[PDB]
Amino acid sequence: MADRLIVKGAREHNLRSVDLDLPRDALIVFTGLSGSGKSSLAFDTIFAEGQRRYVESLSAYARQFLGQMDKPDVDFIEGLSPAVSIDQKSTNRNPRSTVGTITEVYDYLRLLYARAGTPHCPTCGERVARQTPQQIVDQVLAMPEGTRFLVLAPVVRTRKGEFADLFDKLNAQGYSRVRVDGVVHPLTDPPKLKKQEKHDIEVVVDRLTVKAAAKRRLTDSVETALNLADGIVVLEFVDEQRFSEKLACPNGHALAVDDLEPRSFSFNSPYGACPECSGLGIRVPCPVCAGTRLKPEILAVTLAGESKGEHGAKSIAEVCELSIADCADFLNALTLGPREQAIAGQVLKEIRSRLGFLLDVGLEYLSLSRAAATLSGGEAQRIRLATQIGSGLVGVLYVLDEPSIGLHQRDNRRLIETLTRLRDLGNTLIVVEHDEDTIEHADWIVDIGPGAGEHGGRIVHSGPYDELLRNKDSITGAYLSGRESIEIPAIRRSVDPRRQLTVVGAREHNLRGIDVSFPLGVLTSVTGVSGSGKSTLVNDILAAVLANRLNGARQVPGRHTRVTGLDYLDKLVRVDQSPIGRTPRSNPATYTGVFDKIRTLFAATTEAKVRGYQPGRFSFNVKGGRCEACTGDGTIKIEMNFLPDVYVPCEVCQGARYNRETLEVHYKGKTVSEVLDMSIEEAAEFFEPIAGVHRYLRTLVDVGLGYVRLGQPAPTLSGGEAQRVKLASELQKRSTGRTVYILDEPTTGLHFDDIRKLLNVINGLVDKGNTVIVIEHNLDVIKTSDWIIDLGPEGGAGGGTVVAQGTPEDVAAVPASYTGKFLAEVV
Amino acid sequence: MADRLIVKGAREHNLRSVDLDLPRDALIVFTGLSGSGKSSLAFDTIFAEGQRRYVESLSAYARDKPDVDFIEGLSPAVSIDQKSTNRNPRSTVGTITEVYDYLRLLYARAGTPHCPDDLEPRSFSFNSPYGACPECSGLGIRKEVDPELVVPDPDRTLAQGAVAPWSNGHTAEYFTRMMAGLGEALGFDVDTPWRKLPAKARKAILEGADEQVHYADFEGVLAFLQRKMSQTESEQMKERYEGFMRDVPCPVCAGTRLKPEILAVTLAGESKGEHGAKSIAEVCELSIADCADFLNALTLGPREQAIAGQVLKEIRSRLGFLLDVGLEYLSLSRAAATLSGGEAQRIRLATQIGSGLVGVLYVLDEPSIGLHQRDNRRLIETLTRLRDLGNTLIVVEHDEDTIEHADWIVDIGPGAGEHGGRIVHSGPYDELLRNKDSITGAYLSGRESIEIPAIRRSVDPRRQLTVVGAREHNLRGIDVSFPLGVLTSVTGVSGSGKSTLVNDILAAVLANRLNGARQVPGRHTRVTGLDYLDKLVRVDQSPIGRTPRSNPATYTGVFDKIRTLFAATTEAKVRGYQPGRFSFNVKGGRCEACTGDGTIKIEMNFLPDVYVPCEVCQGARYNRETLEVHYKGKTVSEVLDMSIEEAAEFFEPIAGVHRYLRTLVDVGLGYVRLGQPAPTLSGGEAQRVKLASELQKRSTGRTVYILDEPTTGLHFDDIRKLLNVINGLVDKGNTVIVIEHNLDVIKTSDWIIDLGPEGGAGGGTVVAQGTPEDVAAVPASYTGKFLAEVV
DNA sequence: ACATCAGTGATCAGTGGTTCCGGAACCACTGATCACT
DNA sequence: TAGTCACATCAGTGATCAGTGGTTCCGGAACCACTGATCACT
């Protein structure tokens, strides 16, 4: 029938026509190593194929995307369904759109602020309402019964001019009544008029007081005035009342919002955009934002009536500041009106379903106004997880990245249950996740890339994960199932009371002003369920202050009082998964610092001696070293008439960003193109006489960059490998023990073996007399560190405090943190 | 394991809170009536919600309100309908179906550089210029410019301007200033009429000049037209500006779009066919059928056949799917410029069955449109195999063959109009047989049926139309007879070119000679018999009105009659205001709260609006001021309210309104609300409206009606009502000729002209004609064979 | 007792964006009037 | 085979306007100045 999915012919990088058939509508995992090929095998190729198939079948634009995107690197793919990529691929990074808009609830914010918010004009606080003639005619009831008035049709309001001809025309129609400059005369015998003299021409139409059931004559003259007077009349207390119709404000005033319309409060749209920031929120905030990312008129004046929950009186910015939980609980129960209930029931249902899935993932501490940059990858990953589990399309295919980033252990287990829900839905699941518990908890597991780099990409194991245990060759299989594992260091480097960096007064956001101490020169790790605070505790305060002081920057100090520890460190250098550089001038080889070295060595070639090639001339940055047509990229770009772009290798450059003149020099029997393209593995093997570069390259190989090549582009390598090369380079940069620095979650996409390799690397960094604090939720980071601090019992409400600051074994003994609980479980 | 798809609470128009389950990994058919909601459910709600689901699951890009409580057992929905098609011909059929790409891979595996290797699928893809001819870059037609179209009237001064961008608005004044700059730069006078201008001066005008001239540099209307589509937003503007680009295929490869030298050298080794030197220019020109035939047999050497065999099998399978579709006679070089709705439906069906996605939903429409019955039989086999791929197939098709061949059937809209939109059957269709309330089942069981008329309107050879010398394309100068004064009908196999004959030759000539049309007559030496006719009328499924502004009253013209009727009230007299006052599209009487539209409408792009009665209206779509008149005890709102049949039983002693309502009652679809928006009326309903309107024009029958295949939009009973309409017309003297794949319709038509010995270019001549029985006795038509096995 | 690789740093020597410019006028489609007869 | 006879209007019929739908369209190089190396020195 339809119960299995087959892929055949995965031939790319280390993948060698790798193939596999699996049971559709089950839970399946993809394991292996870093760079083992699973990344592209699952995301780049299989997801590309499925999405391309569905978009071509349906009418997505031209049914296409990237012109078939990648060519099919599978001899045959069968039994498929439209793939769904649950990945950290991308999000909404627009500064105009904050997480409030990204959460598909800015529309609902505007919906509520339209009518629930104060529907009143800013100028006079009068309920914004539009012009109507029916109210004009019905206003006769408002004016007391029997009170004299006049049927005054303002035909020509205040427009002065000698208009005896107009008098004659009005007679030609036939009314016999008129009033000019507020004085009545008969059209039969009107007064004289001059252009200089002001003439307020409101023609009397009929003789009437407030009578009973006089609507016949009333309407007769009244719609007449609504045309002649053009919509306006007055019933004065001639014995006051004005029978006028005005749009927007009833009094003809301007409005912050022209009416009760949600888009009026959309600064991403020009409705709410400031004159001086255009929705960006900057000029230093623009003078008309002052913290609120909205126009001051459209901040609260026309929308202060949001009676959400209790005491509800909110500005658009106020709801923005309402955290996830704050706004969700506010909207859980609120009384704004029956029509509002009818037209916002869908609003409540969408929001509550979204929040239920958000809790199913365990994500509330983020705020509606919280900067989208706070997305930790795992955050947006969980956003999409909730979206797709709520979608409920049964049988759809779903390929998962690793969402554990920014998550706790048993929280991740509960999320694993969340996905097993989708498995039970009949949906097909292919997984990728370093969490062990995720492993051993799937209907099927396929381990790949027996070797990590280009050398290994085959499916070393393919079974119920039992064949992973039976598959000893799978190094990751051995690491996970227990054939081998990382080890706890015998010695936890003792505290250093003298040189200790201690933050005091840290109350930024969730933080409760607690003070946190950290020894310097000995390894340390920080723990806490995501949302606890450590992230901004360091970034916004510790790292921010230390960096802008030691290096004289202007970073945000954060909410803190003081930070001791500066005197013990020569400087701070924040280092994280970031790349080396987006520009073409930034490439592995060039930006690793070996650029000038290779340039000089190539100048030292025998040919370069008989050629006089300057080292800077061996740079593509200068024109001499590069092909000017390529501008330093060694390729030809080809765009044509409304057709996709193509690229070709440049011939003079030979694809090396170095014209043939530069490439002719063949340092050590190798041109610049060669000494770029060869792998980092053979680079460490090579340059043996060159002490510095050889040490750098072998350090890179130890970090595990052998299969990568020095000549690769910067974009071609992941941020994890970028930090790998950065740590390898800084390894030989005279640490002196005082370069105590900071680090983020490094466990991203690392197999246990390379995890332990980097563990040894950081052990060396610590033995250098230094400490690079690490923000890692993982267990082994703590189990190997020698000082540990947990941000309160749990995240958010738990966070902003400390439960065990001291030794890793101290926190292990401490059960106040689940981190210490799992430590007690294992060491 | 949940293997069934359930819908819960579909509410729209006559359809209301529809709940039902279907078996997944099965095949589903739909039945009912026009406007009955069967189509609205199958596509307008089911696939509507499915596409909503996949846009909320659009994992790429930035990711309406289906009026349904819930859905369960869902799968991604695929739309397959005569409507779901586009007008982009550049992507020829081969490229669109991707057949081309796998042939390119085959030829890549067929490395044969010939005496004067180098074979990858990219090098064969004329779509992009690795292989595409150097001159045209694989473009079907050279984008030249027509001097006559650019300048229709040379007598006018160049300053006055002939091209559209030179005429309207401040934009036109800018364009005229740039043209004056071009004149003062190049050296052509700006005010000299093209007639008085030198020919080289006109060519320089149309090619512009270099340099920037006020400043703005222009190089004639060659590339600004190409930029206009990019600049403009709506597709209408770009289509307007693309219409008049001369199409002159490049002679260097003469339509065989690829480098003529490369196709002969790099890949002449292809022995695809009679062991001939199959160049890929030839491959491109090869029709679907012929190209498949020579792709079946070909020797390229042991290595090449070994490394290309799998792609050949893939080609055979997908082209077998296309053959079951029946568009094998269509040629690969064919584009979609003249593509038909049924042809596009077939194209999508073949492409998305070749894609071979298992466990994916498909909503489908009438496959029989522009398809022979045996062809649709093999197509039903194709769809049954598609179902064997574990694919759900929601379908709507009146044709019985598709019916009674699905794992499940659902009949909807027991009534057709607003009254009926609910579910009258859902099951294995055996309980459809049990379900006697199903009108489709009643027709199936013979409760209602149609056949030949008791007598065929006698054909007079004297008063006959004739089409001699019609050779346009598939045609070969055939002289064809058409009885006049009676109902003849054009018939034959699908794609047989009889349509093109009609539209380009028959209809074209008749319209330009009688109705004053100025369209191209194709290629015909002459036509005769116009002396027996006065003015033709070509009618099809097109909707009568695309806006709610127009309504049954406005179209029928009875609207002003009823307005005057209301003016006849004594209250109307005393108020002293015109029938236009009583109108609903009139400024004065239209309440500003709705512009007299009844409910109040305001909405943004994201989600649809909701109807809300207005204080003035309460659904009255009027103003009480006007409604105060109650002519014959009825307000204007009430009069516009009661639908056609109730109005018909009303207005009895009146005359013109009586004729209108009698026409509509005879039509029998009077259920339609008098104020029912034209947009809320199906194409078949609009067709019935059009035939009713023409039924009230006293043409004496001298006129002749030509018609498309109208099965769509008309149920069996709707077709019977239309048959009665045409019967009355022809008894009034009218002539008729209809393209139609329905045996009953043609057997009812008193004469048949069946053209086409073979589909496509194999047709182009009368294979038989005469009474339906006469044409049947001649098996030269397959439709004739069918009219023979019947009767 | 150097080391040719070290070691970064503000300016200076290449990059880095951003765009105005708000609309009615004008013209094509069909309705209705508007005769008109 | 002949001059007077005198008791308006449905329904075309479309022109023709005269409203509605939509048009549409340009100039881009400048302007604001901002931003990653390279010797320099240590």
Ligand SMILES: Nc1ncnc2c1ncn2[C@@H]1O[C@H](COP(=O)(O)OP(=O)(O)O)[C@@H](O)[C@H]1O
């Ligand atoms: N931009 C911000 N706006 C508001 N609150 C923030 C912001 N950044 C951080 N926070 C606060 O810091 C906490 C972040 O916790 P986090 O450090 O991610 O947990 P962990 O310490 O487990 O990594 C949240 O509780 C939040 O209230």
Ligand SMILES: Nc1ncnc2c1ncn2[C@@H]1O[C@H](COP(=O)(O)OP(=O)(O)O)[C@@H](O)[C@H]1O
């Ligand atoms: N101008 C034209 N462009 C393309 N094809 C044409 C043209 N004129 C005639 N034909 C031919 O006429 C055929 C059209 O078939 P058609 O008449 O729609 O089928 P049927 O005979 O069933 O109505 C095409 O197959 C084509 O060979």
Ligand SMILES: [Zn+2]
């Ligand atoms: Zn006001």
Ligand SMILES: [Zn+2]
């Ligand atoms: Zn602002």
Ligand SMILES: [Zn+2]
């Ligand atoms: Zn180059």
Ligand SMILES: [Zn+2]
């Ligand atoms: Zn060509």
Ligand SMILES: [Zn+2]
């Ligand atoms: Zn209204």
